[PDB]
Amino acid sequence: NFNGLTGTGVLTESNKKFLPFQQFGRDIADTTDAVRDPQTLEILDITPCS
């Protein structure tokens, strides 16, 4: 339930570098693929459930 956008899937760690103001992000198909940690600002990588 990061930042209100509740979803399901495997949370991993990516090598992406978000901007200091962008929190979440989509892909070509406009689907949430990576979000920031709420209390840590860590660049997480949400992947679809297997």
């Binding site: 901007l19 962008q22 979440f24």
Partner: peptide
């Protein structure tokens, strides 16, 4: 007076 804005004024969209 007036001036021409070639390519400016483009702000960032929602935080995506």
């Amino acid at each position: 007076s007036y001036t021409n804005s070639f390519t400016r004024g483009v702000y960032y969209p929602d935080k995506v």
